[model samples]
Target chain A: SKNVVIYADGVYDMLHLGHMKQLEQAKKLFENTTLIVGVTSDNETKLFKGQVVQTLEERTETLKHIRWVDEIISPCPWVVTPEFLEKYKIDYVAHDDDIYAWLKRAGKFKATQRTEGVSTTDLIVRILKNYEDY
Target chain B: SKNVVIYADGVYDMLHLGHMKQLEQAKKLFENTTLIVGVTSDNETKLFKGQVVQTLEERTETLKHIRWVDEIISPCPWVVTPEFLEKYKIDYVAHDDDIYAWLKRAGKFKATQRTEGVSTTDLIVRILKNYEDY
Candidate 1:
């Protein structure tokens, strides 16, 4: 059987456990899967999710260390087109967001469960609430 | 050869990649290792590091999911005494902090590297800077 290539993308600001879990799911989604992670560029991240904690280089380096990540596409496009998928030989797009409805319809989308309660937002709130300690 | 029992403990507030990396090191420290992780209670965490993003229960559950974790000791003591180590049969204590000087002096300490650039504090600052957007 041919190896499946899965593509997962995110801002990955602090590269927390939640992000790692999503990538883990993508890596294990298919047998003999090559998981290619896309880290959004700084400008693109700021455009959508505001400023990122880590720079593009820092985020990319962190992904390289994760056991699940096979390859990484840095400065990846916010909106991945069919051309993008074909260029990278990505058979499936793995993400929790349903923004890739087109990919889902085409049977090329793999949904990953979002880790509940723990998130970058939740982490921020924790620090803010206990502001002076940190 | 007997299995090495490695002990790693922390508040594990958000259980980020940093924590996971440390645990991974502990798990891989010896060829045959049983990595027991200790999660500090909410009150102890708050006493030391202000407030935790996730409660002790939440932190314990998160540790269970990590591949490296063999066992978990929830609501672990802030200061681990020699008796405590003997009771748990912990051969070495894994941590980045050097607070365990006695353990190190006794050759019962394995130091884990701190993941640079990304941290609970750094994550908090990111959100604070982009508070409105988040």
Candidate 2:
């Protein structure tokens, strides 16, 4: 009865409730699970996605408080390779995005749904809409 | 002894950790306390501050999940009148902002400090700085 190791990665800029819900789902995906979250480095996120508001340290710090998160791998690999999976002993990769084809092909992907009507982007737009008050 | 009833009001659009922390502080301000949060309507917020991303219903829904919140008053008064305080049976008003002068003058103001470096405005600017990603 060993615990299943689940890995989830993201920029996690503002660490809103959307992020929290996703992690919660990943943790509960299995009967007994260890949810290991991977937070992308600022440099990697900026190059691939865009500029991140929170620093690598700050993002990681926020993840530490989430009830679902068991361990954290900061600056995780942008692309999950066999070597990366072997190195971390990850049993499954949980995410809403379809970019992780390697995990999908290997039957190691655990797809989680995105929390609708909310996201880091939406939050930013909300503030921008009320720009003067902040 | 009976619990002290504390009042707090805000737009609560995004409902981040800072808001949660302030509410937590308000709840723990007294040994025995009941924290009642007042959510301003979209119309009032739009008229005075600016646009709000979340509607009154959405804002109130978020507040319902906070552990510290005992009761919620939606479309709360823009200005806390004496009648409003009496009607709600509020002993004190807890807030980081200094706009509640009536509460201050009545010696019923319980001031709380704002969490540094994180705010709805800062979040918006972060997204704008890297607008292409969204």
Candidate 3:
């Protein structure tokens, strides 16, 4: 059988534990799987959310360090396009249920569970709460 | 031949990019290698490097979620004892040269390179400096 290529995308602003959890979860779904991670462009994140601590280059470079991640799509598209799927030969896009709901319904994507208390938002909140401790 | 189990240990309190880089490097060294990560106990971190943000369980659970990590020894011992080695049946330990200097010289462990600007401490400093941004 050929390799199964699974894809997961994120802004990965800080490249923290939460993102790792989701990636691993995606990898666990199949044997001989190639996990491809996509890091969104800083401009995209700025429009969607706001300013991120890490730049697009920094985020993608940081993600390249992970063992489970076989390939990284830098300057990832804002939405998963058919063109994106064709280019990477991505079999499945993995993310939370709320993410890419249309794709999830269409069966082009797999659902992933969010790791609690380890989110980028939560970590930022933690820092804000304990301003000096950090 | 039995699978070669490689050991890597860290506080892993925040589980940031630097740790991921080292794990990826270790996994790249050999095929059919099992990477067992040791998450240093919270008490151990407190005694040695000061307080940590995440608890032992949190750190271990997060590490457990990483695909490269085959096993996790939670509440991990600070020093790599002979008993620890025997219990895990770790064939080789992977880390940077600065870590376990004596053991690295003895060939019981392999050295890994450090990723730039993504360390736990450096990240904390960044948070401190840019308090409001985070």
Candidate 4:
């Protein structure tokens, strides 16, 4: 397949409409596509990312329910670590745009319409900011 | 106020789209309304419903975040009784039309546009069934 895609992102499993809707659409990007998603680890999440601990097992189970995903890969800090793209025979490493454009450019992956508005982290920060108001 | 809308429901504290949308709409039905939302007791729910553990504090805090709700009342028995209605000086006990309309005719609750689609309880059941299928 010339369109097998592997993408990496640091999403803090804060479920919201924007991310859920976009992810649902991402699965239908291509027919007979091998879509592999790499989620950031809890340890890495605690350190570098601001997401609460949504265990890898929980993420795997949640994504498994979604109609689009084929395989669930663990958190890897390096998508350009030589083994990822070549090992998966990845023709496209689709990513959410914005700051993710940097990720796309660095890894030579084409940008997809996967990202719509904001990151799950951004949504969380916004909600927390308005904690007393809501 | 003449419209003393007292709504009592036994919710599983499961967050779903149907409940979210309905709650938002319910808050708009009255001009100067005193909406009292009663979540069902854990004891009653244990005997009658299957739901994940969202603590009283957790549940109350979640409802507080919702703009539709005014005051959060504790859970009661499965049935909404006359004494329950009279005690609060509840002139018009409101509830979702889906189930609580029956609750209205039994006593004095003026059937309001409080219920529709399905309960958070039913949605959870649906999700569990899907798990078995998947």
Candidate 5:
């Protein structure tokens, strides 16, 4: 079986450079790593996180266009589902700092790791904090 | 003059139980506290905060309906601003832990104060984190 990495992120609809960088980096981890970009659902965005700017289908379709990605999955109930790993025969899961903690807590990983630096949410917060014209 | 507490918070597109809790507690601080609920701007919400579930107008209109608030302000750029404080003739500003630090550092002491515990954004985030099923 080919070594596959299941890189996951709770992508809010606001696409930013941080997201592109994160995705670009995640895809480089394996020869044919299948990226499972989980766009937070509109309902989840509205009720829980307060509305994704883009619809799920819109985000899914947008994400599909990235050159580094091989496939995309609609969000499951949770991020680190055994079903996702088992179905894809994933050898690793690429993640960022905060998410790695959650993944470890979920018992989805015997080993949890992360790439450092800006995420879409972080970028959003910074832009809101700093820029007036944004 | 009633000791007016001008409270501000970002009631994101997502409304939650914790938001209710914060608002309820904030109102109790004074007899005539004019709450200034600054709903995050749509542009701010989208680019920086990954999109508020609700439109900015929808959010401001909703906030106006809340009985505790005397007036609602459109979200200004970033966090607490001198302009918002001056325009409202704000006597005392209210916030939470994250904001209180900034207020203190901004030379707003003998002025800015805050209520403790859960905020709307915190509520939304908590809900999103815990109920991944959402």
Candidate 6:
């Protein structure tokens, strides 16, 4: 059986359960899947979103602990390029949202459902409401 | 030198870097500290916070993999009681927040500085703003 290699890219700053849900979903897309996480660097996050909680190294360390994660790409580019696709030898790119239009244009994107009420934003709101509780 | 057995309890459902930061800080409190995490059961979490993301058993598996976690107490009681302290021979309970007033009353609680920027909520917010990415 041929191993299926899947790639997922994100800032993965806080590394919460929502991220895990997506990664888990990515793994289930194929048999003998190898999940590669692309962790965006602090500079890249600052340029794109103007903020990052953890450094690229720190974020990578956090992702390393997850059982579902097979390999990691540090300082992952903010934009997925043809070069990146070829460089990693990725079989496909998987995500839970329809945001990867560029990949769709290339006919290489897969979508899974994003976990509801389990996002980084939801967590932030919860922590703010119960500042002391978190 | 005696090994200091420290106790910390939480739902630990998401297991983010904020949790890691606190645990790492707890380890630094004393020489040869063994960080024992007490993961609250699903029922306990619901009773306290009105919800839970992962089961107690699942959270236990997550905690077990962290390097700083020396031991784990699964389905831990929500409230720390005298029996728990005595049974585990817990030297002290550590946390970044001052919410552990009950343990403080008994002079068994210690406080550490939480990592400021990183938290479960922070991650949630990031995920929401860019739902398609995570």
Q: Return the TM-scores of chain A for each candidate in numbered order.
A: 0.87, 0.87, 0.83, 0.63, 0.64, 0.83
> What DockQ results do all the predictions give, each relative to the true complex?
0.22, 0.18, 0.34, 0.03, 0.01, 0.11
| Global lDDT of each candidate | 0.81, 0.82, 0.78, 0.54, 0.56, 0.76
lDDT assessment of candidate 5: 0.56
**What is the C-alpha lDDT profile of model 4 across A1-134, one tens digit per residue?**
34646453435263333444445455456665666666667776767656353566555444443334566676656334446666767655666545446445665555445444344344334445645865
Which of candidates 4 and 5 is the stronger one according to lDDT? 5
lDDT for A122 (candidate 5): 53
Clash-forming residue pairs, model 4: B96-B114, B96-B115, B97-B115
lDDT of 4 by residue, B47-104 (tens): 6776435555545544544435677777555777668776776555555445556555
Candidate 3, residue A60: the lDDT equals: 81
Worst 10-residue lDDT window, candidate 6 chain B:
B118-127
RMSD of 1: 5.0
Q: TM-scores, in order shown?
A: 0.70, 0.61, 0.75, 0.41, 0.38, 0.56
Quickly count the clashes in candidate 2.
Answer: 0
Q: List the residue pairs that clash in candidate 3.
A: B95-B112
Model 2, range B91-122, lDDT digits (tens) per residue? 99998764577778899999886685666567
Name the candidate that leads on TM-score: 3
Clashes of each: 0, 0, 1, 3, 7, 8
Docking band of candidate 6:
incorrect
Flag the better candidate by DockQ, 2 or 6: 2
In candidate 2, what are the lDDT values of residues A26-128, reduced to their tens digit?
A: 9998899999999998887889898677888878866765557899999787777788888988899999864677678899998898776676577665656
iRMSD per prediction, in order? 4.0, 4.1, 3.5, 12.9, 17.5, 5.5
Per-residue lDDT of model 6, residues B78-121, tens digit only: 87778888999898998755457778888878897766556565
Candidate 1, CAPRI quality class derived from DockQ: incorrect
Please give, for residues A40-125, the per-residue lDDT of candidate 3 as tens digits: 88887888888677778778876766657889889878788878888888888888855577677767888888767776557556
Tens-digit lDDT string for candidate 3 (B1-134): 46788999888767767777788877766878888888888877888898687778777876765557878788778989777888988878887755576566766778799877776567557766866765
Candidate 6 local distance difference test against the native = 0.76
Chain B alone vs. reference chain B, TM-score for every model: 0.86, 0.86, 0.82, 0.65, 0.66, 0.83
